[PDB]
Amino acid sequence: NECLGTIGPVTPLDASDFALDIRMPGVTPKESDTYFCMSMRLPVDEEAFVIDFKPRASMDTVAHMLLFGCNMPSSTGSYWFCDEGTCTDKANILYAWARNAPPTRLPKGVGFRVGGETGSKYFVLQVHYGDINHKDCSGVSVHLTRVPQPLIAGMYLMMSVDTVIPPGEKVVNADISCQYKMYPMHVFAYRVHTHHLGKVVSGYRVRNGQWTLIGRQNPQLPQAFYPVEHPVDVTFGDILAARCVFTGEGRTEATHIGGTSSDEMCNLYIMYYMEAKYALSFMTCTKNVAPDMFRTIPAEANIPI
Ligand SMILES: [Cu+2]
Ligand SMILES: [Cu+2]
């Protein structure tokens, strides 16, 4: 969509509500497969709750977009190259968008809590461009009310650290496993990033070895925030298990976990809501404390698609 210039990025929708348009300050990218980043501070210096997302990019030429919150972006830029980087702190993701894969709405009564003493001070907008003279604005409008929300959003990231894929190695599994600590969470959507060797990602709840699937996606598919059929009450003492499967047939050297095209990532992003009272904005698992368990896993997790 177009550029604003005289209208600016902030739109009141009334007093206790406005939308915020986060869009690249007129960019002219002359590369195919190019990742561009930029940051914007909150208008209000407080607890807002981010309640919607209106996506706006030339389907022509915009492959995928990610929006996270964090309190210190990786450059003082007008824009920059995301390979340079997002937030030098934890960038916790709010929104993801894919072309061939329209996202879903948040549920009414839900919102990511931002700013204030605790919440995120900045939004950072990663914007992937596909194949390709002029000037580009495209990106994401928000809609954030000051009105507190019943159900707070957040992310449980399960991600491998140590994984390694030996070259030509028909199959290498990577497994994450964590025990649940906080108040329960209903899980309403998901996404799954891995680079190429990604055959398939998948993730579950386990209550007395009782596997009840969350998400399953071949990560070469556009890694949107895909919805979870019927919601999943993750309570205390449940185990989050996840498996990315990769192959090594592809390249001539040892692939390890990393943020570059040549490396791999087994990330599984798990977007939940919790009761306001009990809610906390993001959890994480870098461990695989229940490793043996996984024999019990579904074979739906180990065969492809
Ligand atoms: Cu429930
Ligand atoms: Cu990556």
Ligand with smallest separation from the Cα of 235 = 1
Whether residue 137 sits in one domain with residue 159: no
Reported structure resolution in angstroms:
3.5
What is the 8-class DSSP label of residue 16?
T
DSSP letters of 146-159?
Answer: SS--SEEEEEEEEE
Number of alpha carbons in the 13 Å side-chain half-sphere of residue 250: 18
Q: Cα separation of 93 and 296, whole Å?
A: 31
Q: Cα separation of 255 and 109, whole Å?
A: 43
For the record, the structure tokens of 10 come out as 């902030």
What separation in Å is there between the alpha carbon of 188 and the centre of ligand 1?
Answer: 11
Q: Cα separation of 173 and 191, whole Å?
A: 19
Whether residue 12 sits in one domain with residue 89: yes
Please state the φ and ψ torsions of residue 189, each to the nearest 5 degrees: -165, 170
Whether residue 217 sits in one domain with residue 147: no
What separation in Å is there between the alpha carbon of 264 and the centre of ligand 2?
Answer: 7
Whether residue 11 sits in one domain with residue 147: yes
Ligand with smallest separation from the Cα of 233 = 1
What separation in Å is there between the alpha carbon of 300 and the centre of ligand 1?
Answer: 25
The sheet carrying 80-81 orders its strands as: 80-81, 34-41, 122-129, 64-70, 92-98
Whether residue 183 sits in one domain with residue 144: no
Q: What is the CATH number of the domain that holds 203?
A: 2.60.120.230
Whether residue 241 sits in one domain with residue 287: yes
The number of distinct structural domains making up the chain is 2
Q: Cα separation of 161 and 244, whole Å?
A: 12
Look at residues 94, 118, 153 and tell me which one is the last residue of a structural domain: 153
Whether residue 149 sits in one domain with residue 1: yes
Whether residue 1 sits in one domain with residue 140: yes
What separation in Å is there between the alpha carbon of 214 and the centre of ligand 1?
Answer: 14
Tokens 């030339």 belong to: 58
- Taking CA atoms, 119 is separated from 19, 99, 152, 225, 260, in Å, by 18, 29, 12, 22, 29
Whether residue 66 sits in one domain with residue 168: no
**Domain enclosing residue 8, as ranges:** 1-153
Ligand with smallest separation from the Cα of 35 = 2
For the record, the structure tokens of 59 come out as 């389907």
Q: Report CA 13 to chain centroid distance, whole Å.
A: 27
Ligand with smallest separation from the Cα of 128 = 2
Ligand with smallest separation from the Cα of 66 = 2
What separation in Å is there between the alpha carbon of 235 and the centre of ligand 1?
Answer: 9
What separation in Å is there between the alpha carbon of 303 and the centre of ligand 1?
Answer: 30
Whether residue 1 sits in one domain with residue 134: yes
- Taking CA atoms, 75 is separated from 33, 39, 88, 95, 148, in Å, by 21, 8, 9, 21, 31
Q: Ligand 1 being an ion, which residues bring their Cβ within 5 A of it? A: 233
Q: Cα separation of 101 and 62, whole Å?
A: 13
Q: Are residues 43 and 128 in contact, defined by beta-carbon separation less than 8 angstroms?
A: no
- Of 6, 12, 67, nearest to 38 (Cα)? 67
What separation in Å is there between the alpha carbon of 186 and the centre of ligand 1?
Answer: 6
Whether residue 134 sits in one domain with residue 48: yes
